[PDB]
Design an enzyme around this catalytic site. Sequence first.
Site, mmCIF file in Angstrom:
data_model
loop_
_atom_site.group_PDB
_atom_site.id
_atom_site.type_symbol
_atom_site.label_atom_id
_atom_site.label_comp_id
_atom_site.label_asym_id
_atom_site.label_seq_id
_atom_site.Cartn_x
_atom_site.Cartn_y
_atom_site.Cartn_z
ATOM 1 N N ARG A 7 41.047 60.548 9.908
ATOM 2 C CA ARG A 7 41.392 61.734 9.134
ATOM 3 C C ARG A 7 41.237 61.399 7.662
ATOM 4 N NH1 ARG A 7 48.062 61.723 9.979
ATOM 5 N NH2 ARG A 7 48.146 59.730 11.119
ATOM 6 N N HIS B 79 41.903 65.763 13.001
ATOM 7 C CA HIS B 79 41.786 64.362 13.385
ATOM 8 C C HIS B 79 40.606 64.189 14.338
ATOM 9 C CE1 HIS B 79 42.707 60.333 14.701
ATOM 10 N NE2 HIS B 79 43.623 60.265 13.752
ATOM 11 N N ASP C 270 39.533 47.372 16.141
ATOM 12 C CA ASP C 270 39.774 48.387 15.113
ATOM 13 C C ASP C 270 39.122 47.976 13.791
ATOM 14 O OD1 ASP C 270 40.916 49.538 12.791
ATOM 15 O OD2 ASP C 270 42.922 49.649 13.661
ATOM 16 N N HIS D 40 39.625 49.514 22.243
ATOM 17 C CA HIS D 40 38.656 49.366 21.161
ATOM 18 C C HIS D 40 37.330 48.788 21.659
ATOM 19 C CE1 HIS D 40 42.225 49.954 18.552
ATOM 20 N NE2 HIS D 40 41.324 50.612 17.845
ATOM 21 N N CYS E 142 37.295 52.351 16.791
ATOM 22 C CA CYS E 142 37.302 53.319 17.883
ATOM 23 C C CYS E 142 36.762 54.686 17.477
ATOM 24 C CB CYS E 142 38.710 53.459 18.491
ATOM 25 S SG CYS E 142 39.967 54.219 17.434
ATOM 26 N N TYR E 143 36.830 55.009 16.187
ATOM 27 C CA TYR E 143 36.329 56.297 15.718
ATOM 28 C C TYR E 143 34.804 56.302 15.704
ATOM 29 C CZ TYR E 143 41.189 57.072 14.613
ATOM 30 O OH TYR E 143 42.557 57.161 14.758
ATOM 31 N N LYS F 88 42.662 58.234 5.291
ATOM 32 C CA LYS F 88 43.286 57.207 6.112
ATOM 33 C C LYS F 88 42.229 56.112 6.275
ATOM 34 C CE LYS F 88 46.854 57.079 8.183
ATOM 35 N NZ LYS F 88 47.771 56.801 9.333
ATOM 36 N N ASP G 97 41.412 44.619 22.163
ATOM 37 C CA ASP G 97 42.039 45.297 23.288
ATOM 38 C C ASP G 97 40.910 46.038 23.987
ATOM 39 O OD1 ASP G 97 41.752 48.082 22.282
ATOM 40 O OD2 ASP G 97 43.283 47.483 20.829
ATOM 41 N N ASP H 134 38.244 52.632 11.318
ATOM 42 C CA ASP H 134 38.687 52.064 12.592
ATOM 43 C C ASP H 134 37.536 52.124 13.593
ATOM 44 O OD1 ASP H 134 39.664 51.575 15.156
ATOM 45 O OD2 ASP H 134 41.524 52.698 14.871
HETATM 46 N N1 U66 Z 1 46.290 60.015 22.943
HETATM 47 C C1 U66 Z 1 46.169 59.385 21.977
HETATM 48 C C2 U66 Z 1 45.949 58.558 20.813
HETATM 49 C C3 U66 Z 1 46.883 58.580 19.745
HETATM 50 C C4 U66 Z 1 46.692 57.787 18.588
HETATM 51 C C5 U66 Z 1 45.557 56.952 18.460
HETATM 52 C C6 U66 Z 1 44.605 56.906 19.532
HETATM 53 C C7 U66 Z 1 44.782 57.692 20.707
HETATM 54 O O1 U66 Z 1 43.766 57.546 21.701
HETATM 55 C C8 U66 Z 1 44.156 57.039 22.973
HETATM 56 C C9 U66 Z 1 43.305 57.282 24.082
HETATM 57 C C10 U66 Z 1 43.693 56.821 25.376
HETATM 58 C C11 U66 Z 1 44.937 56.130 25.561
HETATM 59 C C12 U66 Z 1 45.318 55.684 26.850
HETATM 60 C C13 U66 Z 1 46.545 55.001 27.037
HETATM 61 C C14 U66 Z 1 47.418 54.757 25.938
HETATM 62 C C15 U66 Z 1 47.073 55.190 24.623
HETATM 63 C C16 U66 Z 1 45.819 55.880 24.434
HETATM 64 C C17 U66 Z 1 45.384 56.341 23.181
HETATM 65 N N2 U66 Z 1 47.980 54.946 23.527
HETATM 66 C C18 U66 Z 1 48.978 55.916 23.108
HETATM 67 C C19 U66 Z 1 49.176 55.596 21.639
HETATM 68 C C20 U66 Z 1 49.041 54.059 21.576
HETATM 69 N N3 U66 Z 1 48.555 53.571 20.250
HETATM 70 C C21 U66 Z 1 47.205 54.003 19.801
HETATM 71 C C22 U66 Z 1 46.856 53.473 18.422
HETATM 72 C C23 U66 Z 1 45.462 53.681 17.917
HETATM 73 C C24 U66 Z 1 44.465 52.737 17.871
HETATM 74 N N4 U66 Z 1 43.290 53.216 17.353
HETATM 75 C C25 U66 Z 1 43.568 54.477 17.076
HETATM 76 N N5 U66 Z 1 44.862 54.810 17.398
HETATM 77 C C26 U66 Z 1 45.410 56.148 17.189
HETATM 78 C C27 U66 Z 1 48.029 53.794 22.717
HETATM 79 O O2 U66 Z 1 47.327 52.805 22.802
HETATM 80 C C1 FPP Z 2 41.158 62.037 26.061
HETATM 81 C C2 FPP Z 2 42.042 61.452 25.003
HETATM 82 C C3 FPP Z 2 43.343 60.886 25.527
HETATM 83 C C4 FPP Z 2 41.685 61.447 23.708
HETATM 84 C C5 FPP Z 2 42.509 60.881 22.576
HETATM 85 C C6 FPP Z 2 41.824 61.135 21.244
HETATM 86 C C7 FPP Z 2 42.514 60.586 20.023
HETATM 87 C C8 FPP Z 2 41.866 59.333 19.484
HETATM 88 C C9 FPP Z 2 43.607 61.175 19.476
HETATM 89 C C10 FPP Z 2 44.341 60.679 18.256
HETATM 90 C C11 FPP Z 2 45.585 61.523 17.929
HETATM 91 C C12 FPP Z 2 46.542 60.916 16.909
HETATM 92 C C13 FPP Z 2 47.970 61.384 17.086
HETATM 93 C C14 FPP Z 2 46.152 60.038 15.930
HETATM 94 C C15 FPP Z 2 47.078 59.421 14.906
HETATM 95 O O1 FPP Z 2 47.322 58.048 15.211
HETATM 96 P P1 FPP Z 2 47.325 57.015 13.994
HETATM 97 O O2 FPP Z 2 48.160 57.470 12.841
HETATM 98 O O3 FPP Z 2 47.819 55.685 14.596
HETATM 99 O O4 FPP Z 2 45.806 56.760 13.581
HETATM 100 P P2 FPP Z 2 45.028 57.020 12.216
HETATM 101 O O5 FPP Z 2 45.641 56.298 11.045
HETATM 102 O O6 FPP Z 2 43.581 56.541 12.505
HETATM 103 O O7 FPP Z 2 45.027 58.557 12.057
HETATM 104 ZN ZN ZN Z 3 41.408 52.497 16.872
#
Ligand code: U66
Ligand code: FPP
Ligand code: ZN
EC number: 2.5.1.58
Lengths: 313, 407
Positions: free
Chosen positions: B275, B232, B336, B346, B283-284, B278, B343, B281
Amino acid sequence: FVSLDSPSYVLYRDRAEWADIDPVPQNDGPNPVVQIIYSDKFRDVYDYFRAVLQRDERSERAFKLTRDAIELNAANYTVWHFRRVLLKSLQKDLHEEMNYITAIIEEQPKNYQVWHHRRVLVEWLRDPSQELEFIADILNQDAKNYHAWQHRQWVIQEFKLWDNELQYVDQLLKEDVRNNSVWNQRYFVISNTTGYNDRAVLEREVQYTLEMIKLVPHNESAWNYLKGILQDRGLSKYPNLLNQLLDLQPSHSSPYLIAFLVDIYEDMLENQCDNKEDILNKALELCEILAKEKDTIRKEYWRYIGRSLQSKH
Amino acid sequence: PVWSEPLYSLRPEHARERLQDDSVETVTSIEQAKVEEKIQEVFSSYKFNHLVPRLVLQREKHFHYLKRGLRQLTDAYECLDASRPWLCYWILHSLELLDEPIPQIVATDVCQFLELCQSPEGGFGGGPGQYPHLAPTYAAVNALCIIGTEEAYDIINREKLLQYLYSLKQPDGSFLMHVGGEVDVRSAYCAASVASLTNIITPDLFEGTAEWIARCQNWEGGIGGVPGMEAHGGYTFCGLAALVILKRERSLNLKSLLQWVTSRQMRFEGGFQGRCNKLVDGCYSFWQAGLLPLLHRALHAQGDPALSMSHWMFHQQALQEYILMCCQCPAGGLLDKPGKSRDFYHTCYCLSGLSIAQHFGSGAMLHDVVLGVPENALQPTHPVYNIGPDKVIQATTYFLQKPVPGF
Ligand SMILES: N#CC1CC=C2CC1Oc1ccc3cccc(c3c1)N1CC[C@H](NCCc3cncn3C2)C1=O
Ligand SMILES: CC(C)=CCC/C(C)=C/CC/C(C)=C/COP(=O)(O)OP(=O)(O)O
Ligand SMILES: [Zn+2]
Ligand SMILES: OC[C@H]1O[C@@](CO)(O[C@H]2O[C@H](CO)[C@@H](O)[C@H](O)[C@H]2O)[C@@H](O)[C@@H]1O
């Protein structure tokens, strides 16, 4: 007892059984930043959670309070830690807690804290009997839930529950052959059971993957898995694969097939292949085709590959 | 004509990049097709036959949205009550990228608030009185560094911070996210980030960590949250950035990682997915595209003679097109994908990603590609820490003048 949405719910500042303890307001400072305008119920619960935490009160009332705090914000890891401390102090029934976490995860399956809480419970109980079925239900709602799959790998590995996972994998691939999380689980299961060094296993996998590719030629997951199970030994090590891919070239082409061909040529050149010049020209031609027409989004990558090939051979 | 700029996403051949489901529908292809249909509509709204007006980053709208959020938030943010230092970081870094000055009063208030979030045991929690956690600790440190004043720098209790990191270090090289918490690659990155910036790295703090991270790289080439899990972008960024800080990038198969990340850029949308198979988005734009400057640096250190001297190895233009056309909220803030709510998270990463796509830098070589009106140019961001490069240098210089707590 009573939920935050229950018609008879009462704020903690109004509960007689809580009158003996003073609430502890949050100290954000005189000139607060990123200040959240909390609802009255949200602030009420947390003012009391802060009181109990600061007081390190290991009580049943504190235990119930954490459930409300969690409903208000399930991402508050401080509350979860304290609830965990209370679970032990009060010697709470863990199977009861398991039923609780089960409902919570169902409501918020993408939360990190709820999954970790469940793992801790399973570790404390040393009982994984409910895990595979529970995860399957979560995945039935979202087949790619990252946390669900991670918890699944942990349980299987920690309690050695490998016996039926390959069948589970095959079922989900039938449902959606594009589910990359499932292809990953497939690699996870095989690498940890038979491994891929068993040539009969590798052959079965290559045949299975090739059939999936011909069924859905543009499904990237299958192509990645094919390269994934052969890359370590070297793609040039499988002469028949190159020919079989070459035959599909016209009647099955795609950037995935062309890219795989370049990967093969790369490895071939890296292993002192015969007809070096010819292989190099083929590879360079394909890099150009990918860069200019078939995979332009990756033009910079393919140009790079072209230049690398030239600097090495 | 300077008033018309042809776009990659609007070329006629681009229609060929639409999904080919091979007449075999599954939830995956159906969802992908839906996104593509919506994105095509958006793309078309920016084209008027041969007239293609320059794209515009709505700076002022984003600025007002950010300025407002820095002081207050609606209860809609109660779900982030344990992540307030993150809100500070996301907002300050967004303003920084937008080159919007931070009032001294606001800066000092942020410092005071982050001080209240700091735990007596070391590290920062999600809010005043909360237990420390590596995620908000990472956010708070970055925020304090963006402010860059001695006042901000000195808020950090370095002695306790190092002890806290030690209290989370596992024997296999991994770190817990917090006491009694879960472990995944995010922790290693959060720890390496704050430790290197504040100069508290000891020889044994990260012993075994690089190897543990390498074990997280999988068959796909990318990196998963823990060994065995799916690759991921989020975990891959965390893993590679952490290895770069530790100077152990070579522990990974950089070839399979490079091929994996470049494949994550969507041929049609132009943005990146998290990934394989999927959805795209915004943020990626940072988590994934940010891996290219890191890979560039890693390969350069190895003397790779084929590296570009002017571009990152992804489609910089396409990513800017996706962000500018599909990720901006009319009312300010970014997102996204079209149809999603804005938010600060993003907003932070879409802008961070846009900046990376606009600026290439390697050695004395600098090459910019700012799509749209010239004013779209953002301030550069450091690929490892994701705060201005100037902020990184100033912070590291300041802390290097202090000793490592207890050696
Ligand atoms: N750690 C971690 C992460 C797990 C999953 C991610 C992104 C992700 O990256 C993050 C970085 C920093 C973060 C700081 C505070 C809360 C977070 C958060 C997520 N969370 C937990 C999950 C929740 N939903 C996120 C939904 C989301 C939105 N865009 C990508 N996303 C997948 C959310 O906003
Ligand atoms: C320092 C720090 C906290 C970094 C976080 C980095 C990051 C973005 C991690 C994502 C991990 C994760 C469980 C994604 C799946 O979420 P999903 O299924 O909602 O997203 P998807 O469909 O795009 O995979
Ligand atoms: Zn995102
Ligand atoms: O991306 C493949 C690359 O990753 C390494 C780790 O750096 O190994 C991963 O992938 C293998 C399959 O190719 C798995 O067997 C292994 O468990 C996983 O960590 C490299 O060895 C490999 O070349």
